[PDB]
Design a protein around this ligand. Structure first.
Ligand code: NA
Ligand code: NA
Ligand code: NA
Lengths: 175, 176
């Protein structure tokens, strides 16, 4: 219930900011218990899945991700849905803009899905999720069903990407 | 194809490790292009406990500072059961987290896949699991599966791994 901020210690502020936050929780009859956690703030982002109900395909993005490279992704290439850190603007604008610039497709009306914390134990990151129809950074158009199999094989292994493809499966918008 | 690590600068070593990594990447024709923050908090695992007979799932509600400083007013977040890997196989680890967090013991565990949650600057790889359960400052939540799906729509559940497990559970037909 009651949370009190005790200390905000900056551990690094190179570009993003890492904090050690000292804080106090009250247990029931407080019984105030002190905790101290690292918190990483890279701001919030948005992501969008592009899909074609006609030829039954989706558009996805492949690029080198260094944080995967030093942690078991041998070549470091990661297949992901289009995405980007939010700039100083409404989320709906930034994502339209990422989609054009990363994929080269012009995108119609977007649909807002939800806003999710992707890794809330130590990162603040909130992502806004969107889907839309459509008609170096490697641009992959591939059939929906191949994308879905790629999940099962481990070839797609990006949390937000799997989440989107799964959402799209259950939407039946591809049915 | 060619990747060369040029410099691993440690920006923080308080507990987890924040690196600044300078790396050369080679393109198409041998154009060598040269820096990014990489945060290493180790890997984790998560699990969705479900019960096919009562059509319920178990989740967890806890305070999360990282959300508290970023629009989760009360800091409480409803998540699937989860934890950072110890030095052992993921499945062993998650069996422990599930019992130590929920009190419901589990037999079968099914591994779904391993996903990077925030790959643009976090190395974290989460190992996903489901398992059916029974009995026979962390609040354990037993809820109707359909209630849980709704809560994604209402926004009462707003956590990446939890949504992905729930949607997964829906697609599997285990709960039809
Ligand atoms: Na859905
Ligand atoms: Na460096
Ligand atoms: Na990025």
């Amino acid at each position: 219930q009651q949370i009190t901020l005790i200390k905000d210690k900056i551990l690094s502020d190179n570009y993003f900011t890492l904090h050690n936050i000292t804080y106090d929780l009250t247990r029931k009859d407080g019984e105030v218990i002190r905790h101290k956690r690292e918190v990483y703030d890279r701001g919030n982002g948005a992501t969008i899945l592009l899909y074609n109900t006609k030829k039954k395909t989706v558009v996805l993005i492949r690029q080198f991700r260094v944080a995967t490279w030093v942690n078991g992704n041998e070549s470091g290439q990661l297949i992901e849905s289009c995405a980007g850190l939010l700039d100083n603007d409404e989320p709906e604008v930034c994502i339209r803009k990422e989609a054009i610039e990363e994929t080269g497709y012009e995108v119609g009306e977007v649909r807002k899905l939800f806003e999710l914390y992707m890794s809330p134990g130590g990162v603040t990151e909130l992502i806004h999720f969107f889907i839309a129809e459509y008609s170096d950074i490697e641009v992959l158009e591939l059939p929906f069903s191949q994308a879905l199999e790629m999940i099962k094989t481990g070839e797609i292994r990006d949390g937000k990407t799997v989440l989107l493809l799964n959402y799209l499966q259950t939407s039946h918008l591809m049915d």
